[PDB]
Amino acid sequence: MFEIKKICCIGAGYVGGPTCSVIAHMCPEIRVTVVDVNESRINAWNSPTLPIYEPGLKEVVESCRGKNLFFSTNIDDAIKEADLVFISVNTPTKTYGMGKGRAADLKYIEACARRIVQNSNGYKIVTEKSTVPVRAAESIRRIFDANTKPNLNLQVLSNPEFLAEGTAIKDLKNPDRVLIGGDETPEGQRAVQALCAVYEHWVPREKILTTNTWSSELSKLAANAFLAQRISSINSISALCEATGADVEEVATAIGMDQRIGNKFLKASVGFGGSCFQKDVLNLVYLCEALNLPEVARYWQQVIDMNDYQRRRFASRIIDSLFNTVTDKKIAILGFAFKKDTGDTRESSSIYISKYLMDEGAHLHIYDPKVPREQIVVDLSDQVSRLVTISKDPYEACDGAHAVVICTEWDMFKELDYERIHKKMLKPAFIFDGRRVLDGLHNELQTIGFQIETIGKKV
Amino acid sequence: MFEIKKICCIGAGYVGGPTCSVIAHMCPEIRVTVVDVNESRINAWNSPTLPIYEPGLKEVVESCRGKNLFFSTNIDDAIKEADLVFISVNTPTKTYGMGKGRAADLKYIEACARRIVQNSNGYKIVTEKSTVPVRAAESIRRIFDANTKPNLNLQVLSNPEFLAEGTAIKDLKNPDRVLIGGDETPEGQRAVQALCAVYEHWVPREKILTTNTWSSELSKLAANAFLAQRISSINSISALCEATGADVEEVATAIGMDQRIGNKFLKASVGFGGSCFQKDVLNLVYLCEALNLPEVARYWQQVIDMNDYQRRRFASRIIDSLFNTVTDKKIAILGFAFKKDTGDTRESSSIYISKYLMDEGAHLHIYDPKVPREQIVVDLSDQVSRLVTISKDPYEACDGAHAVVICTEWDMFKELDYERIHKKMLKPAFIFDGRRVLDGLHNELQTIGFQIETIGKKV
Amino acid sequence: IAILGFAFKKDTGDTRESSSIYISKYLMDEGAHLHIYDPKVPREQIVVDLSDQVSRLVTISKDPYEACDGAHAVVICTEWDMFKELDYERIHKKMLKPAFIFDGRRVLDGLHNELQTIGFQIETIGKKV
Ligand SMILES: NC(=O)C1=CN([C@@H]2O[C@H](COP(=O)(O)OP(=O)(O)OC[C@H]3O[C@@H](n4cnc5c(N)ncnc54)[C@H](O)[C@@H]3O)[C@@H](O)[C@H]2O)C=CC1
Ligand SMILES: NC(=O)C1=CN([C@@H]2O[C@H](COP(=O)(O)OP(=O)(O)OC[C@H]3O[C@@H](n4cnc5c(N)ncnc54)[C@H](O)[C@@H]3O)[C@@H](O)[C@H]2O)C=CC1
Ligand SMILES: O=c1ccn([C@@H]2O[C@H](COP(=O)(O)OP(=O)(O)O[C@H]3OC[C@@H](O)[C@H](O)[C@H]3O)[C@@H](O)[C@H]2O)c(=O)[nH]1
Ligand SMILES: O=c1ccn([C@@H]2O[C@H](COP(=O)(O)OP(=O)(O)O[C@H]3OC[C@@H](O)[C@H](O)[C@H]3O)[C@@H](O)[C@H]2O)c(=O)[nH]1
């Protein structure tokens, strides 16, 4: 019966932007307009310097911008003439009220739903696409159900996004699965079927899963948690390794070869970050508490607690090696993004390690090859003026530093000329490898004269 | 240049038996003698009725018993003339003292190590092969180090077993990996190398991992924990599903298609059993406490707690549907083994569900197509005489039963003639599917007139 | 396991609150077969002090050498001067290996190398580990 010719996506961020760019590149006969309230963000999408760093994104966007892909601040007209409307906005964590610091704030999703009613007539498909959807489908539906025009027929779908930042293009093109939730009604099926059509342009039919909206959202919450759990589990083992002279990377390989366990996501680290994982577990915990499932609640909470412990442990290892005093000591922080190949800092372990060292009065010199320097400044908030310097390049940061702390797995960090760094560092020269990037360069670094300490090997 | 011609394995159980049988079948030029103190177990190994049920085991044993595979009670002479000695004995959980209910008792491992010293001269390789090795290598080594003859040279290796009961043959032949731990010394490497040689007869060289003994044992502890954790995680989700009208199997598929998560071991169930998992986690927890890592300890403990909760919940679901009273009510228990395709009941969720129902005064009629009936009796201990009947076949068990409770995923349970059962059950007729075996037969069973309740779903 | 010394200090027969009672009970909860020697504590007192579980695990030794015969470890709880004197080569020959001495009183200070030469694994309060 129905074919999607015009698509509108509200929210031009790390989800909405790339996911739409790819849709446009795969569906040249579809008009894709991505809208936002943030003007300078949209402007940047239209510039040759994109607002987010993501490998292969400049290439995908340029290939079809001004053709079938558009970025505009004109939300109203895009919703008005669109067949499908994506909601890909952020649901920040509530800072006050019940759920403070824990439950997600649906205020922006709601604002979108309202603004869609006000600007729509006829048939439209409204699809919620977030990285961690929390009761989102249901809250849109209740706004639509109450603000009913005649001849207005709005279908609500859930379509969670599985992309991982830094590899968004690769992931969007060859996704592991696509998950679409819709109502179990005649009208619901037709809307689901229509969205599959979009995806079927480049995704195999048996890689597309269709279900009801709630089962869809729950799947994503759980999926995210399982992922987060693996990192926390291996990090836990990393503490055990340091305590008993084993090596987590080795133990990891051995764990990983069980085809029932899989060998991905066992890379122990200073702790997981990003806007997905921590927020997702917290919401799952909160949900369980509200449903009167305290046993489940406290089970998943452990993922967060382990992660917190992982960070705090690594921090006090640095503070220890410096004889529990770092007042007016130059420390280099290499890497601020929550992972490699992005500029995103949301929830980066870097932020936390940094703050711990700041509470010790360390003079921090921070370098990251892609994170905007204003962003580093915002993230560490006064006390910032006295202690923080954003370095132009890594060598400035390490010049006269007592210690070098690696927090993000940027490939460029294996490359640095380490003899040069050692010459101009204060002795004893410490490298703290929170990412396991300097594995294999181990002897060399000791030969040069480094005292070299890494996560999950030899406390 | 060393070559292993004679092998002796102390312990002829679910580990030692099958793992040696397969060694003999793959290495026809090696003499493999499996010894035990239990006489009627050895006798049964030599009979046409083997002491343990395991698919394909009869075929493997018969093909090379008397030719190169021997089962004998004569421990002393087997040790005396062997090049390699396996220790594959049980380490039961301490019932008293520090570690009560938690830490493993190394008493039998020690008895073996002593008995080996007393019966050995020259060069021998001693290899510890257990399903969950706890400080086993180290304890053997301290006995050998102190009881030193001249010309006696005993090498200690760790070689954890990854097989899963019910698929031991398939697993032993195509293992995911083989893990060997030996000392990082000239003498150590030679012994490790010698053991690889045995395995290289049928296992690709790049599927064999070599390391130090401790790193090896820790790997197995961790690996086992990760496995157990998946089951508990999905089980936790199953409670969430039941509370919100989603379906865990569906959710599971969606989680499972993430190639980073893998799709194995997401089969929600009434709770994991067997002699590996619970015992492994407890020892890991205990080890962490002792190493002053409480944060890690309490992280892994959650796996056990969730599992306990999973069982308790399912139990009181049955008691609930029967209006909180089961005094003098006939309930059929289908399945008693901890999993399908074995006779083993060690830690079977069936034991626990059964006891919960016994404390309610239920008359239980238990059927399992492979569990010896004496074993069921031992496992439920007096109160047994008054309440328990071991049924000859499933239909006896369901005759006049208020409810049928499925605890083990035996394939034969989908086959049963369910109209027949429903005719002779008291109404309302309840089926409780703790294994998800009756998925797909859902309407049929409702048509027939069953009230059908299953894990991860709601009525 | 051999327990040498049961009196709460040397040169008395008094056991009231002796650390020996406590060490012994901890080792009993582990199911150790205890052979207890004290040159001045009435045998009956030892029996009262460890209270059934006593019958199965406790033996009051006539002299120290009986106690250490076939023992895995020797535990010294009371600073009786006579304990420095014992013929330790004799004890080690008839102990199960590895032979442990646990010096809870610091009486074997100075005899340290000798005991290691003989082949003991020797651990004491306040040293090493
Ligand atoms: N914002 C936060 O602090 C957090 C958000 N999350 C979640 O994780 C996922 C990440 O999504 P991103 O694309 O990375 O977020 P984002 O913040 O990078 O991009 C969202 C864009 O939506 C725009 N927007 C918000 N409300 C709007 C409205 N009412 N009308 C028009 N535009 C609007 C914002 O201005 C922003 O440019 C989200 O889908 C959300 O589920 C999780 C934790 C924290
Ligand atoms: N038995 C229990 O209750 C528990 C055992 N475990 C663990 O499960 C793992 C799997 O091993 P299985 O083959 O399933 O156990 P098993 O008990 O089925 O086989 C071990 C065999 O070793 C024999 N044996 C024991 N001590 C011996 C000795 N000192 N000398 C000679 N023979 C001796 C026993 O007679 C027994 O038949 C074990 O390696 C152990 O780590 C964990 C928790 C509980
Ligand atoms: O093995 C690992 C993997 C990841 N991490 C760290 O944990 C964080 C997780 O980042 P991811 O690589 O999972 O990617 P993202 O956080 O950008 O996206 C993640 O949530 C959004 C979902 O769409 C993706 O399915 C999920 O992977 C990063 O800091 C990463 O470096 C580890 O410390 N160890
Ligand atoms: O999805 C699952 C998988 C497994 N399980 C349960 O977990 C228990 C053990 O299952 P397994 O397949 O692991 O059988 P085992 O316990 O004998 O083997 C396990 O322990 C020993 C190790 O060598 C093996 O690698 C490990 O699989 C059973 O109760 C099984 O039903 C689930 O409940 N759900």
Side-chain angles (χ1 to χ4, degrees):
Chain A
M1 319 267 191
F2 189 84
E3 202 200 320
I4 295 166
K5 268 86 61 90
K6 285 162 172 198
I7 290 170
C8 165
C9 178
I10 314 175
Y14 285 85
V15 173
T19 144
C20 282
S21 308
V22 173
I23 287 174
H25 176 73
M26 301 312 211
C27 310
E29 94 288 5
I30 305 196
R31 276 179 62 90
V32 185
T33 321
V34 183
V35 291
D36 206 299
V37 306
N38 185 314
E39 214 189 314
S40 65
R41 181 166 262 195
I42 293 287
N43 290 338
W45 275 112
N46 286 311
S47 74
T49 299
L50 290 179
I52 67 171
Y53 174 82
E54 183 83 35
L57 183 70
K58 185 194 150 68
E59 287 72 61
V60 168
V61 166
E62 276 169 5
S63 95
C64 52
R65 182 182 65 198
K67 189 138 335 125
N68 75 320
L69 174 74
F70 304 101
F71 299 96
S72 170
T73 73
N74 179 359
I75 293 139
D76 286 311
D77 276 335
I79 302 171
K80 203 149 69 51
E81 75 170 43
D83 295 295
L84 173 87
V85 181
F86 276 128
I87 303 169
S88 296
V89 298
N90 52 296
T91 59
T93 305
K94 287 185 79 196
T95 42
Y96 49 80
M98 285 162 200
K100 177 187 170 160
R102 299 199 302 151
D105 201 336
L106 293 184
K107 71 183 177 197
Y108 302 142
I109 296 267
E110 283 194 339
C112 279
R114 275 181 210 287
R115 186 144 188 195
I116 286 161
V117 164
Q118 214 154 8
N119 279 242
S120 285
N121 286 288
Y123 185 80
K124 279 178 209 287
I125 299 169
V126 180
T127 287
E128 209 277 323
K129 171 175 282 309
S130 57
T131 212
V132 29
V134 211
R135 253 151 71 84
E138 177 192 351
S139 85
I140 296 160
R141 216 187 300 104
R142 207 167 310 153
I143 289 179
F144 287 4
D145 282 349
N147 299 271
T148 185
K149 285 169 194 183
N151 277 341
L152 180 75
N153 182 41
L154 293 162
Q155 296 303 300
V156 196
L157 301 188
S158 190
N159 179 224
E161 192 46 58
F162 292 100
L163 76 91
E165 303 184 9
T167 55
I169 303 308
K170 171 190 132 60
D171 290 351
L172 277 158
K173 292 186 158 164
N174 198 24
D176 279 332
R177 77 298 205 197
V178 159
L179 182 66
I180 294 157
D183 301 41
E184 272 144 29
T185 64
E187 275 286 45
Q189 300 314 348
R190 194 204 326 282
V192 171
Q193 156 83 327
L195 185 53
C196 298
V198 179
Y199 280 112
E200 276 172 321
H201 277 71
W202 83 104
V203 181
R205 189 39 170 105
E206 85 287 358
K207 276 188 170 186
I208 292 165
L209 288 167
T210 72
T211 180
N212 72 83
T213 69
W214 170 247
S215 196
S216 159
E217 306 202 320
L218 177 63
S219 299
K220 186 71 153 97
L221 282 205
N224 285 336
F226 274 72
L227 283 164
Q229 192 182 51
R230 289 175 73 88
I231 305 152
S232 269
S233 286
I234 199 75
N235 278 338
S236 77
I237 302 306
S238 91
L240 232 182
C241 292
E242 298 174 25
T244 64
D247 175 348
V248 72
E249 280 293 304
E250 273 185 53
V251 174
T253 310
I255 300 166
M257 293 191 60
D258 200 319
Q259 289 197 302
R260 294 163 308 172
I261 300 180
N263 74 355
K264 305 295 188 313
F265 262 51
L266 295 166
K267 230 90 194 139
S269 69
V270 64
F272 64 76
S275 66
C276 182
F277 283 170
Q278 191 185 308
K279 137 91 111 54
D280 175 282
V281 183
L282 281 182
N283 269 100
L284 174 69
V285 167
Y286 185 83
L287 179 65
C288 284
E289 255 154 29
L291 290 167
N292 183 33
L293 299 167
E295 292 87 1
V296 182
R298 76 175 73 87
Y299 179 83
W300 284 105
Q301 178 65 50
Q302 275 304 306
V303 184
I304 300 317
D305 283 0
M306 181 46 62
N307 202 47
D308 289 328
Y309 172 67
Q310 181 75 337
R311 287 166 164 180
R312 223 162 48 234
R313 187 166 57 94
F314 189 74
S316 43
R317 273 235 262 153
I318 299 158
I319 307 160
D320 255 344
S321 295
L322 280 31
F323 317 90
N324 212 275
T325 178
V326 294
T327 315
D328 305 354
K329 285 197 191 181
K330 218 221 198 211
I331 291 156
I333 307 305
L334 301 188
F336 207 84
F338 80 98
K339 61 173 280 187
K340 79 157 151 168
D341 289 345
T342 186
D344 191 358
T345 69
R346 288 174 294 169
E347 291 305 329
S348 159
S349 282
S350 291
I351 294 165
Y352 295 82
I353 302 303
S354 293
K355 283 207 209 227
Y356 287 102
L357 295 170
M358 280 171 74
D359 293 335
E360 300 286 339
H363 294 156
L364 294 182
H365 288 243
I366 304 168
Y367 170 71
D368 186 293
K370 229 84 210 174
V371 168
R373 41 145 298 139
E374 285 79 357
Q375 186 59 83
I376 297 175
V377 177
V378 175
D379 274 347
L380 309 176
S381 327
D382 170 34
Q383 181 189 39
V384 213
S385 343
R386 314 189 281 95
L387 304 159
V388 174
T389 300
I390 292 80
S391 281
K392 196 75 203 187
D393 78 292
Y395 297 103
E396 258 181 28
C398 307
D399 206 309
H402 295 244
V404 175
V405 180
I406 294 171
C407 296
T408 317
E409 79 280 20
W410 283 110
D411 293 304
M412 64 161 303
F413 292 151
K414 317 167 180 194
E415 318 294 36
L416 311 184
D417 169 27
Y418 278 108
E419 320 198 11
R420 179 182 156 188
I421 289 160
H422 186 255
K423 271 170 190 170
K424 333 217 181 188
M425 276 184 78
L426 271 170
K427 318 286 184 291
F430 288 104
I431 297 171
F432 290 96
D433 185 3
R435 284 294 190 176
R436 292 306 284 251
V437 285
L438 313 187
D439 288 13
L441 283 74
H442 260 285
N443 314 321
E444 282 79 343
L445 291 165
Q446 259 149 348
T447 301
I448 300 173
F450 281 116
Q451 271 241 236
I452 160 77
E453 312 228 60
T454 171
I455 283 223
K457 185 200 245 168
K458 188 210 158 40
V459 90
Chain B
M1 72 259 169
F2 187 87
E3 199 201 320
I4 292 163
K5 268 87 60 90
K6 286 162 174 197
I7 291 170
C8 161
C9 173
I10 314 175
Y14 286 85
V15 172
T19 145
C20 282
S21 308
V22 171
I23 289 174
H25 178 76
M26 299 311 205
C27 309
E29 95 287 7
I30 304 195
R31 276 182 58 96
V32 183
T33 323
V34 183
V35 294
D36 207 299
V37 306
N38 184 320
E39 213 189 314
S40 60
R41 182 168 263 193
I42 293 286
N43 292 335
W45 274 110
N46 286 310
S47 73
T49 301
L50 288 178
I52 66 169
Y53 174 81
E54 181 82 38
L57 184 70
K58 189 191 153 68
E59 288 72 65
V60 167
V61 166
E62 275 169 8
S63 92
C64 56
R65 190 187 40 195
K67 311 197 203 203
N68 73 311
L69 170 75
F70 303 102
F71 301 97
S72 162
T73 70
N74 177 6
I75 292 141
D76 285 314
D77 276 336
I79 304 170
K80 204 146 69 48
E81 74 172 44
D83 299 291
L84 174 87
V85 180
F86 281 126
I87 306 169
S88 298
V89 298
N90 51 295
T91 61
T93 302
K94 287 180 80 188
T95 40
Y96 47 81
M98 284 165 195
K100 176 187 169 159
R102 298 198 303 150
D105 204 335
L106 295 181
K107 69 186 176 194
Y108 301 147
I109 295 266
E110 280 196 346
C112 280
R114 278 183 207 282
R115 191 144 187 199
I116 284 161
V117 162
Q118 209 151 8
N119 280 242
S120 283
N121 289 287
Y123 183 81
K124 281 179 207 287
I125 300 173
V126 182
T127 291
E128 205 275 326
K129 168 175 288 304
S130 54
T131 215
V132 26
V134 208
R135 252 151 71 85
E138 179 191 348
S139 84
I140 293 165
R141 217 187 299 105
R142 206 167 312 153
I143 288 177
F144 289 5
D145 281 350
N147 299 274
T148 182
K149 285 170 195 178
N151 278 341
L152 183 70
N153 183 37
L154 291 162
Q155 298 302 299
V156 196
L157 303 186
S158 190
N159 176 221
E161 193 47 55
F162 293 97
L163 74 89
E165 304 183 10
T167 55
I169 299 309
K170 175 187 125 61
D171 289 348
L172 275 158
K173 291 185 162 163
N174 200 22
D176 275 336
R177 76 297 203 203
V178 161
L179 179 65
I180 293 158
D183 299 41
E184 273 145 37
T185 65
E187 276 286 46
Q189 298 311 350
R190 195 201 326 281
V192 173
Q193 158 80 329
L195 190 50
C196 301
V198 182
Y199 281 111
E200 278 174 316
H201 278 69
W202 83 106
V203 177
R205 189 37 170 102
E206 86 290 355
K207 275 190 169 187
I208 292 163
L209 291 167
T210 70
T211 188
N212 72 78
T213 68
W214 171 244
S215 190
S216 163
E217 303 199 322
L218 174 66
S219 300
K220 187 67 159 100
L221 280 209
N224 286 335
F226 276 71
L227 281 165
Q229 188 181 55
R230 290 174 73 91
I231 304 150
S232 269
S233 286
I234 198 75
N235 278 333
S236 80
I237 300 308
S238 88
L240 231 185
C241 293
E242 291 178 26
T244 62
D247 175 345
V248 71
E249 282 294 300
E250 272 185 55
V251 178
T253 314
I255 301 166
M257 295 194 58
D258 202 316
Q259 292 199 296
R260 295 163 307 175
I261 299 178
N263 74 359
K264 304 295 192 309
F265 263 54
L266 297 168
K267 230 90 196 140
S269 75
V270 62
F272 62 77
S275 66
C276 183
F277 287 169
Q278 186 185 315
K279 137 92 112 57
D280 174 271
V281 181
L282 281 181
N283 273 95
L284 180 62
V285 167
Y286 186 81
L287 176 69
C288 289
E289 260 155 25
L291 287 164
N292 182 32
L293 301 170
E295 292 90 357
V296 185
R298 73 176 73 89
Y299 179 83
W300 287 106
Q301 182 63 52
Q302 274 305 307
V303 183
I304 298 322
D305 283 3
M306 178 44 64
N307 201 44
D308 285 332
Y309 172 65
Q310 183 71 337
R311 285 166 166 177
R312 224 163 44 237
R313 185 168 57 94
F314 186 75
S316 45
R317 270 238 265 152
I318 299 156
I319 307 156
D320 259 346
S321 305
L322 287 27
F323 315 89
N324 214 275
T325 185
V326 295
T327 315
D328 308 353
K329 288 200 191 179
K330 218 223 200 212
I331 293 156
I333 308 309
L334 301 187
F336 207 83
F338 80 96
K339 59 173 280 190
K340 82 155 150 168
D341 300 340
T342 193
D344 196 356
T345 67
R346 285 176 297 171
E347 291 306 331
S348 161
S349 284
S350 284
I351 301 166
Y352 295 80
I353 300 302
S354 294
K355 285 206 212 226
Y356 286 100
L357 297 167
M358 279 171 64
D359 294 341
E360 296 295 334
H363 294 151
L364 295 179
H365 289 243
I366 305 171
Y367 171 70
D368 184 293
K370 230 84 207 172
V371 169
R373 39 146 296 139
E374 283 85 349
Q375 187 58 82
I376 297 176
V377 175
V378 173
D379 274 346
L380 312 175
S381 326
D382 171 33
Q383 181 187 37
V384 211
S385 344
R386 315 185 281 94
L387 302 159
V388 170
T389 301
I390 291 77
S391 279
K392 197 73 204 188
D393 80 291
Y395 297 102
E396 255 183 31
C398 305
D399 212 310
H402 298 243
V404 174
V405 179
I406 298 174
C407 303
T408 318
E409 78 281 18
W410 286 110
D411 292 299
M412 67 161 298
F413 291 151
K414 319 168 178 192
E415 316 298 35
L416 310 186
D417 169 26
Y418 278 105
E419 319 200 12
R420 183 181 154 188
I421 292 156
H422 185 259
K423 269 169 194 173
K424 333 220 184 186
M425 278 186 72
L426 270 169
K427 318 288 186 287
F430 288 105
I431 300 171
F432 289 97
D433 188 2
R435 284 290 192 174
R436 293 306 284 248
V437 282
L438 312 184
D439 287 10
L441 286 73
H442 260 284
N443 317 324
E444 284 79 344
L445 289 166
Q446 258 147 349
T447 305
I448 301 171
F450 280 117
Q451 272 241 238
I452 162 80
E453 309 231 64
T454 174
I455 281 216
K457 253 210 111 11
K458 55 332 160 334
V459 237
Chain C
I1 293 159
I3 306 306
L4 304 186
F6 207 84
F8 82 97
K9 60 173 283 184
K10 84 162 152 144
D11 283 2
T12 185
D14 196 356
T15 71
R16 283 177 298 168
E17 292 303 332
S18 160
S19 282
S20 297
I21 296 166
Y22 292 84
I23 304 302
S24 297
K25 283 211 207 223
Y26 285 104
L27 297 168
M28 282 173 68
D29 292 340
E30 298 292 334
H33 292 155
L34 293 182
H35 290 244
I36 302 177
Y37 170 73
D38 187 292
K40 228 85 213 168
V41 170
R43 124 181 231 129
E44 318 82 278
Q45 249 310 202
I46 300 176
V47 174
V48 175
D49 278 347
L50 312 175
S51 330
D52 169 32
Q53 182 188 38
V54 213
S55 341
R56 310 190 283 95
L57 303 159
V58 172
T59 300
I60 289 82
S61 279
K62 195 74 202 186
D63 80 295
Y65 298 99
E66 257 182 30
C68 307
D69 206 304
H72 296 246
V74 176
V75 181
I76 296 170
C77 297
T78 322
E79 80 281 24
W80 286 110
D81 291 301
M82 69 160 299
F83 289 149
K84 317 168 180 194
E85 315 298 32
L86 311 184
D87 167 27
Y88 278 106
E89 316 204 10
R90 180 179 156 192
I91 290 159
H92 184 254
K93 269 167 192 174
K94 333 218 176 188
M95 279 184 77
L96 270 170
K97 316 291 183 291
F100 286 101
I101 301 173
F102 289 95
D103 185 7
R105 282 294 187 176
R106 290 308 282 252
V107 280
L108 312 186
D109 288 9
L111 282 74
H112 260 287
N113 316 324
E114 283 80 342
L115 288 163
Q116 258 149 351
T117 304
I118 299 169
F120 282 114
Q121 271 242 238
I122 162 79
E123 293 177 350
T124 172
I125 286 216
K127 232 216 292 213
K128 3 157 67 224
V129 111

